[PDB]
Structures are given as C-alpha cells and as structure tokens.
C-alpha cells in the first residue's frame, strides 16, 4: 500500500529515535514550556501535507494558529471537526494493520530561541507528554524521529539539530495508524497534541538520567525497612552522589490546589529537618541500600511521606543537578491469597477515572484533576483505576500526597474486534465467568498476533518505567478488554523483570495465567460466589483474590444495590472490593436547539449530537458525577455504602465498628445529634467495635480538624435508629355540618362550609377539590391512577421494553358504577367509584374501587386494586395518583428521606428528618429521566400561600412522592429540552420500581422490583 | 407580516397581518409558471437552521419583500412540471417589487404601485441568534 505511508501501517514501528523511558521528575530549572500558540494546518491525508524537510518558518508563519495543548476536534466553531463517540465498535474498517487512506493529518510548527552559552552548557531534548494518535518530529528541517502511544510520553535528543538563534520545531500528527487498533477505549475519539510540550536543558558533561526507589520491609512485623536508591548517571564529569532523607510529614498534612500544584523552585530550600544522610565515593556505584529504623508507613488512609534530596556532585564539590522528591514506606505483596499492603489485606473503595473535561476533553488542566481527587476524598473513595491509560505524569504526586490506592494501566484496548462477531452471532449477553471463550475467538487478530508483540511490550515498558517511584501505585494493569493472548504473557514477564515490587492486573485474563489477581466486571452475586467457591480449597485457602475492576455502572438514575455488593465485600476475605464505573459523565459542552423552547441553549453532548456515522449514544453519560464533574445522587449513595465506620443504633445502644484498613477512629468526633453533645468513643483499631448505652436516635461521625483536603466538621459516617411510622395528630372534624349533595347526570357535587368536591362520574376525575382555600384536582389523561415513569438509562434495555410492550403508558380508567351516599360517622358524604383500569389492546387490568369519604377538613381515599386477566406484565414502573396543585401552591415540606431523591434500592444515604423544599437544589440529570422521587415518606405538607398546609399521609406504610413542573421527559434529549407546565403537580405513589444497574450489569434485584400484584392503600388529605 | 399566502403591492389586502410559519402554508402552484411566492409588507423574517436556531432579518424603517424557494427556469417552463429545482433553497430579499395589475387584458399596473426608476437606499440587518 503505497498510498498509506509505511510507518502508519507497521505495528513494529513503535517509535524512531525515542529515548528510553525513565522515571518522571518535573524540574523547573530543566523544563521549559513550549505550550502556547503554534502555526497549524490540517490536511486530508499524509500525501497532502508538506515535506517537513522543506518547510520554512517563513511559510508556516502564514498559517492560522492553534493552542498547545488542545484537541483539534475541540476548537472555536468546530473549525477542525467534531468529536466522535464509539464504545466498542471501531470507527474505521478493520483491515489490520492498515489505517484508512483518508487520514486527517495536522502539521504543527513553532520556533524557539537558543543562546551561544546554551548549546555549550546543556543537552537539549524535546519531551511530549501526549499526542494522539502518532507523529513524526522535525527540527530545523531535519527528521528527528517518530512515536506511537497516545497517553504515553516521549523524549528525543535534539542536540545534533539545534542552532544559535531561531530554531524550528515541526510536528506532523496523524489521526489513525496501526496503533488505532490497540487504542479502542470506550471514550471520545480526539486528536492532536493534547498534553504539554517541553524543551529540556540537562547539564551537559554529566546529569541524572534515571532513579529507582524501593522500600522493602526487612521483617514480618513490618518495622525496620531497607531503602534502596539506585541512580543512573550519564557522562564522566562527576565525583559522587549525596542523598538526604528528611523527617516525615504525617499524612494528615493540610493541602489545597495551590500547594499541591506549586512547582517552585531553584533557590527554594526543599527541607532542613534532616534524618539520614549518605554520600557515595569517587569511582563507586551510584547506588546504595540503607537500613531505616521503624519508619512511618505510607498508606492511602494516611499518606505519610519522607521528602528527600538527591544531589549530583562534581570534582569541585559543587551541585551539578538536584532531584527533590519523596519516599513512601510501603510494601505490596500477594500474601495468603490477598493483595496485601504492609501485611494488611486492603479494601478498595474505588472508581475508574478517565481523563475528561467538558470543554477541553482529554487535555485536562491539573487544577481540574485536583478538583476530581478532592471530591473523591470528600466522598470516602480510597482508590482509583486509571481507566484505561496513564494520565499526565504530574498527576501521580497528587495520588502520593492525598492517598489513593492506584491501578496504573497500560494504554491498550482491543474491544472492537468483537463487534462484528457479536452482530454476526446475535450475541445478547456476556457474563464474567464465560465471556472469555467469546474473546478467545478473535484474540489472534491482535493480542495473540506476533506482529503486535513489540507494540504490546512498549505499552508495558512505557507504563512502568515512567511511574515506578510512586508509592500510591500498587498495581500495574496490562490494559483493558483486549482479549487474551501471548502478547499479554510477554507483558507480564517484562513487568515482573522491570519492577518486581508490584502486582499485575488484567481482567481479559480470566484464570490469571499471567496476572497476580482475579478480576470481574459487573458480576452478579451468584457469579462472584461461584468463583469464590471454585477457587477456595477444602482448607479455606485461596491462591489469589477477587476485585471488581468495574461494577455498579453509574449511568443516570442509579446505580441500585451498591448496598448488596458491599455486604458481600465485608463478608469474605476473598473479595477485596471494587472500582465503580465511572467517575464522571463524558459530556462535551455545546449549543443545543431546544425541543421545549425552539431556542438555543447550553447542553452536554453524547453520541449522536456531533452527527457521527456510527456512535453509541448516551453511554457517554455513565458517571457518579455529571459532565461538569459535580456529584449526582449516585456519588451521594456511594459515599454512604462505603463509609469506613459503621454506626448501628438499636435497643438503647450505639454500636460503632471501625471499618478502615489501617487508621484509628481518634481523628473522629462522634456527636449525638438528638442532644448536640459529643460521645466519648474509645480509640478503635481496624475491625474493633464498641457498644455504648444511649437514648440517641441519630449519631454522626465527623472530622475533628482540617486534615488532607478535608475540613473540620466534615461528615465521614453516620447512623440512625429506625423510625416507626407515627400517624400525625390531625383532628378530623366529625361534628355534624349541613352538606348539600348534588348527584347530577355526569357530575357529583358535595358542598359544605369551607368545602367543595366535584367528581366527573364519566371519567372518575376530580374536577376540583377546594378545602379551606386550598385546591387540588386530578392531573388526568385516561386514568386517575397512573403507572408510567420516564425510563431511566437502566430501564431502557429491558424493563422499559416490557412496560411499553404491555402498553403501561396507555392505561385507561373505565368507570362502571358510581355510588353516592350521605355521610355516616362524622362523615359529610361517601362517594364510591367502581371501575376497570386497563390499557388499550389488553385483557389485564385492575378491578378498582375508590372510596372517597368526605369530612369537613379531610378526605379519606381508600383504593382497592384487584389484578385480573390473562397476559400480564411482570412489573410496573410506579403506581399512584397525579394531582394538579392550585395557583396558591408555593412550597412543600416532608418527614422522610432527604434532602435529595430516593428509590427502593438507592435510598440509604438519604437519612430521615424533616425537610423543606426551599433548602434543596433538586438534581438536574444530563440525560432527562425519572428523578425527584422521595421514598419512605411518613407525611407530606403542601403549603399554599395565605391558606396554610395540606397534610398527606398513607395509612400503615410510608409512601412515595414527587412534586414538579416538568413533562416531555421521555423524549427530551438534554436538560434544556424538558418542557414545563404553568402549574405544579403532585405525583402521589403507593409504590415504585427499583433502579438497579441494568444498562450494564444486574437487573433490579427481586426485593426491589414492583411486581404485578393487587394494590390496597389508604390516603388522607388533611386540610389545615 | 402579510399571509398566509403571497402578496403584491396591488394584491395584498386579503393577506392580513400576523405571525406565519412556512410549515402551515401550501404555497400556490400556478398552472402557467410565473412570478409567485412574494410576501409584501414584511416586518421581520426568521430563517430556521437545524441545530443552530434562527437568522432574523429586518429592514430599517420600512417593511420589505421576500421569497424563499427552490425553483428556477420559471420564465421558460410551459407547465408546473417543467419547473426546475436547485439542490438548495435561496432567499430573494427585496427592497421593492413592481405591482401586478391586469394588463394581459385591461389596465396597466396603476401608478402608485409601479416600481418607478429612481435611487434606492435601504438598510438590512442580518441578526444571528
Ligand atoms: Mn437537546
Ligand atoms: Mn410542459
């Protein structure tokens, strides 16, 4: 293929002239930023791009500019195209290893100045932190080299090519290559120089090239440790190295964005609290091993660090070069079948975090990454998986300093090889225990393809060697969803040779033939349990443990049943936790035309919005946080289920259990919320508990002092005693009032002092109910009892299909008889309505009786619903009344769960209390769907201006409710597409279907499904 | 402006003022192809583009004339089916238009409706949402 350049279709051409990967250290004196505006031009294919060996700056000066770093699909006015979202499917034809012939080619150009002294004093390099998909590099019209690996770094020696005065850098960037085949992550396709570019000036005669730091405990009691520091010095003109370790700074250290990101400086004195000092001798190995007496452990719960300074020293005793970094005393092992840190079998409270920003894409400002991690810490997360590639190299100090268990993952995904197979065989489902047999069929294309070994090894080597020295990283991962083949085995051997100190993860390797860990994604409890039992021997020993690298798919309203996963995690030593998918929605900000408005509004794009030929729609929106990286109810729930302290209140006792891996409860203040006075809680070690006699209902665990990125008073954990349903002390007026009852041909009136009740007998509709200045009426379309909800993302694949199939959205009320009688026991009147509630097309439906017992200040509504007929649905979304609220309506207040929404399998984070609608910002989903329900509601007060409240309560059971404004939610593509009525309604529900995680994972669990059955429930509408 | 149908200086009064949508109107097809589809006394015109909102167009201090269509070869098309059509629409945005009269058999367009030869001065705004 001579119409495709050779280097874009050669799997073995991983790079040309790239320097060997070394440990990353930012040094202000060495690094010089080349970020900013670059001359840029985009071409249809390589053959249209100029020969860079002949490109003048005088020519390139005339081009438009683009700012580095940034993706070229994310420019003002979409100048160079729009983002493309695919999940599994490749956006190109599969013809391994050929890219498409039409291959967008971007040529970048800029200049930089070089001194006379500069070329004499320094070795000059160019370092590119990330370029997608690949590029060739030119300096002063001379080819320097080539590079592949979009999320990896690259350094090139530039010394031969540089001149005094102006120097010309030209980068030719290509969108597709043979590399595309191994970069098929479920994310946006975006191109360009999207990470930093630097000019490095290293001291010329001698400099530090690489450093290796390891900490190994000498003992089984993890006290004394060996600190090993090995340095690779390049050049002859040096004497020896010095090394200074400083006194530790405890992990409770206070940080903010400014101090975490501070990059200074040359004359800045790193530290002076010396602890250990070592010097090397002239002509001796530039490495050493030191015994360290009982050092402070580095742990994710307490990220204690020892700062150090490594000095290269010349003959005259002057400092040639300094490295200022840190040491975290930590050892990871596979021990008695568990992932062990410092001897302790840890629990992952994790997320997968992609690089994403709603405007900049994968070109994420560090500022924003910091924001992410602070939020994670604020929500009890202790681990992150780098799905599915290494991040910007500066990010890993953030993990080191804040404390996260990190899985650093190779930039390698092959998923798309399956898509034609899936479609050809009409595959419906993949299961963690059996799906590997399906991937085995196509492994030969890439992961079991010998032509790709060099590429696969390069992804491994690049991953490990850049980040080896970060204590936060405890696991290397071979990539994601790339099938299983010989190349993976090769990667495993290499990684163990390169870095024996860490463990290797790869989910595509079911039996972990070349991994140290077992891993499932989105498994069912039954599947987890099968695996556990088949890998635990008769003695109770297992050889390797199980993590969930992906679980509890956080797409839209959900995920449900995080609770049940967690119970499982705590019950078995074999399970060591999981990482939920995903941290945040991948939405890109754009201008949307509103379906509600006809006008232009800001929105967040998912597949389809940028008009891709092939895309995967709304699967972009699968985070615990929204596109703007702010918490959803998903994140709020997750924080509660993973809380590292359990507080249980029953039988006049508070039981507190420490569920941390390492730290004590000493940092925590326990407050009795009923009294406001604090509770003396003994210092609890991991797994220790205490029972304290108390009359309390509600206990909170809170932070005593600012520590890390958390503030004093920040809530870590809480507990409540279960709250019995109490009937409010409303006094029903049972005194005898004269009441006019008018039973007309169609309409029935009941009028009394301060009361007006009108029912349409033909429809079963309340035309108007006005009691003491407060009015409601039925929000009626076919039925007074409705069943539908705007489908969640989780509803879509199955439950929605069923509910639509059974016409649940077209449920009709057909009145059979209406009975009108004078009031009896204090009653004004009794109106009884007999009807069938059934959808068009169908037999099934409810023989329904609605008894309205009317009092002067109250209306008792008894509902009896008898499920009848053949060919019924399995379940319903919802069941209850819909009422229009009067013009007087202003706000509401409830006793129940809050402040936010709650659903049967997503409710426990929302504690009981009295809540006011005015105190709550109601959550807006990026993708419109079922929202705003409040479950386990004891009573609801609706406030009408100038007329007090209407109190609503269900007899003997708590109920569900939603008060809103909105409609057209089913078909609104974005928040701005949601329509709004001129008045509010109340959705008053007996029951509601759970939420689950079926968009990708298990269906709503049995106990949370709203199964088809008879419904019997009684409501009171009490008017003040 | 005037609608729902077409309007011309001496043939416009049946077309009352209001807000009109092109989607609500079956545009009239003449048995003999000729000048058609003009809208006179137009206050403003909104052109809707998919996924990008509207372009608003208005003439300063006087109402204007406009036609939005598809068609050409109208002069020489003998019948409706002889009318040619471009692959895109155009806007004919007019300061002024000659009246219609009844001169095929009867009086010429009356004086006050004739587009007399004279200087033309007019200002348009192309406002993008
Ligand atoms: Mn929209
Ligand atoms: Mn003809």
Curated annotation (Swiss-Prot), chain A:
The gene is LAC4. One of its GO terms (cellular component) is beta-galactosidase complex. Pfam families: Bgal_small_N, Glyco_hydro_2, Glyco_hydro_2_C, Glyco_hydro_2_N, LacZ_4. This is Beta-galactosidase. PROSITE patterns: GLYCOSYL_HYDROL_F2_1, GLYCOSYL_HYDROL_F2_2. Keywords: Glycosidase, Hydrolase. SMART domains: Bgal_small_N. InterPro entries: B-gal_small/dom_5 (IPR004199), Bact_Beta-galactosidase (IPR050347), Beta-gal/glucu_dom_sf (IPR036156), Gal_mutarotase_sf_dom (IPR011013), Galactose-bd-like_sf (IPR008979), GH-type_carb-bd (IPR014718), Glyco_hydro_2 (IPR006101), Glyco_hydro_2_AS (IPR023232). It catalyses: Hydrolysis of terminal non-reducing beta-D-galactose residues in beta-D-galactosides. One of its GO terms (biological process) is lactose catabolic process. It comes from the Eukaryota. Its EC number is 3.2.1.23. Transmembrane segments: none annotated.
Curated annotation (Swiss-Prot), chain B:
Coiled coil: none annotated. Belongs to the glycosyl hydrolase 2 family. This is Beta-galactosidase.
């Amino acid at each position: 293929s001579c119409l495709i350049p050779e280097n874009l279709r050669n799997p073995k051409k991983v790079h040309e002239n790239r320097l060997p990967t070394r440990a990353y250290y930012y040094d202000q004196d060495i690094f010089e930023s080349l970020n900013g505006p670059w001359a840029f031009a985009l071409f249809d294919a390589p053959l249209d791009a100029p020969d860079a060996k002949n490109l003048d700056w005088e020519t390139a000066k005339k081009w438009s500019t683009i700012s580095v770093p940034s993706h070229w699909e994310l420019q003002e006015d979409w100048k160079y195209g729009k983002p493309i979202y695919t999940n599994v499917q490749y956006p190109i034809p599969i013809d391994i290893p050929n890219p498409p012939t039409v291959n967008p080619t971007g040529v970048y150009a800029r200049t930089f100045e070089l001194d006379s002294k500069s070329i004499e004093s320094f070795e000059h390099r160019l370092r590119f932190e990330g370029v997608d998909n690949c590029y060739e590099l030119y300096v002063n019209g001379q080819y320097v080299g080539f590079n592949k690996g979009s999320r990896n770094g690259a350094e090139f020696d530039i010394q031969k090519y540089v001149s005094e005065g102006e120097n010309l850098v030209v980068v030719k960037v290509f969108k597709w290559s043979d590399s595309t085949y191994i970069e098929d992550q479920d994310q946006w396709w975006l191109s360009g120089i999207y990470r930093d570019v630097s000019l490095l000036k290293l001291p010329k005669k001698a400099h530090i090239e690489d450093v290796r730091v390891t900490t190994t405990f000498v003992d089984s009691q993890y006290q004394d440790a060996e600190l090993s520091v090995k340095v690779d010095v390049q050049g002859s003109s040096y004497d020896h190295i010095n090394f200074t370790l400083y006194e530790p700074e405890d992990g409770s250290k206070v940080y903010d964005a400014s101090s975490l990101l501070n990059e200074e400086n040359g004359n800045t004195t790193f530290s002076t609290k010396e602890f250990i000092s070592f010097s090397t001798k002239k002509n001796e190995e530039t490495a050493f091993k030191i015994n360290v007496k009982a050092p402070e452990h580095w742990t994710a719960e307490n990220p204690t660090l020892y700062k150090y300074q490594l000095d290269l020293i010349g003959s005259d005793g002057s400092v040639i070069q300094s490295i200022k970094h840190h040491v975290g005393f930590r050892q990871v092992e596979l021990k008695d079948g568990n992932i062990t840190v410092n001897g302790k079998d840890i629990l992952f409270r994790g997320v997968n975090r992609h690089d994403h920003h709603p405007r900049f894409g994968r070109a994420v400002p560090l500022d924003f990454v910091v924001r992410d991690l602070i939020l994670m810490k604020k929500f009890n997360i202790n681990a992150v998986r780098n799905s599915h590639y290494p991040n910007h190299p500066k990010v890993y100090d953030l993990f080191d300093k804040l404390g996260f268990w990190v899985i650093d993952e190779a930039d390698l995904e092959t998923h798309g090889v399956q898509e034609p197979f899936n479609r050809h065989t009409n595959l419906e489902a993949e299961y963690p225990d059996t799906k590997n047999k399906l991937y085995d069929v196509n492994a030969h294309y890439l992961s079991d393809n010998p032509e790709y070994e060099v590429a696969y090894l390069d992804r491994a080597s690049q991953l490990v060697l850049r980040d080896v020295n970060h204590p936060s990283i405890i696991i290397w991962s071979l990539g994601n969803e790339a099938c299983y083949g010989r190349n993976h085995k090769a990667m495993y051997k290499l990684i163990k040779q390169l870095d024996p100190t860490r463990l290797v993860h790869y989910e595509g390797d079911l039996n972990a033939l070349s991994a140290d860990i077992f891993s499932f994604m989105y498994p069912t409890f039954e599947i987890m349990e099968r695996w556990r039992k088949n890998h635990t021997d008769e003695n109770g020993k297992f050889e390797k443990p199980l993590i969930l690298c992906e679980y509890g798919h956080a797409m839209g309203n959900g995920p449900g049943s995080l609770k049940e996963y967690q119970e499982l995690f705590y019950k078995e030593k074999f399970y060591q936790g999981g990482f939920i998918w995903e941290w945040a929605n991948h939405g890109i900000e754009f201008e949307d035309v509103s379906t509600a408005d006809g006008k232009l509004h800001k929105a967040y794009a998912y597949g389809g919005d940028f008009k891709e030929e092939v895309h995967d729609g709304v699967f972009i929106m699968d985070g615990l946080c929204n596109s703007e990286h702010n918490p959803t109810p998903g994140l709020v729930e997750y924080k509660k289920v993973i809380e590292p302290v359990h507080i249980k209140i029953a039988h006049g006792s508070v039981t507190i259990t420490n569920k941390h891996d390492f730290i004590t409860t000493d940092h925590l203040l326990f407050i009795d919320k009923d009294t406001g006075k604090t509770i003396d809680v003994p210092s609890l070690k991991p797994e220790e508990s205490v029972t304290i006699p108390s009359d309390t209902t509600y206990v909170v665990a809170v932070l005593k002092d600012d520590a890390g990125v958390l503030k004093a008073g920040h809530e870590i954990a809480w507990g409540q005693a279960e709250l019995p349903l109490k009937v409010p002390d409303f006094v029903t007026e049972t005194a005898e009032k004269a009441a006019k009852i008018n039973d007309g041909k169609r309409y029935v009136s009941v009028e009394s002092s301060g009361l007006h009740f009108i029912l349409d007998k033909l429809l079963g509709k309340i035309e108007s109910l006005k009691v003491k200045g407060k009015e409601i009426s039925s929000k009626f379309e076919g039925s007074s009892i409705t069943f539908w909800r705007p489908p969640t993302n989780n509803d879509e694949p199955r439950d929605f299909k069923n509910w639509k199939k059974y016409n649940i959205d077209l449920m009709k009320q057909n009145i059979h008889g209406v009975s009108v009688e004078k009031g009896s026991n204090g009653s004004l009147a009794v109106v009884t309505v007999n009807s069938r509630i059934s959808p068009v097309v169908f037999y099934y439906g409810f023989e329904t009786v609605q008894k309205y017992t009317i009092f002067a200040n109250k209306i008792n509504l008894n509902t009896s619903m008898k499920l009848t007929g053949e060919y019924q649905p399995p379940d319903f979304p919802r069941v209850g009344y819909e009422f229009w609220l009067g013009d007087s309506y202003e706000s509401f207040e409830w006793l129940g769960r809050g402040p936010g929404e709650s659903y049967p399998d997503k409710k426990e984070s929302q504690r009981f209390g009295l809540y006011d609608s005015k105190d709550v910002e109601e959550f807006v989903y990026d993708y419109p769907q079922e929202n705003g329900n409040h479950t386990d509601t004891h009573f609801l007060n609706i406030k009408f201006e100038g007329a007090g409240k209407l109190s609503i309560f269900q007899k003997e059971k708590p109920f569900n409710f939603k008060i809103s404004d909105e409609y057209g939610v089913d078909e609104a593509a974005h928040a701005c597409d949601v329509k709004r009525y001129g008045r509010h309604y109340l959705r008053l529900d007996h029951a509601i279907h759970g939420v689950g995680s079926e968009a990708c994972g298990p269906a709503v669990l049995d106990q949370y499904r709203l199964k088809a059955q008879d419904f019997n429930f009684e409501f009171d509408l009490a008017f003040e």
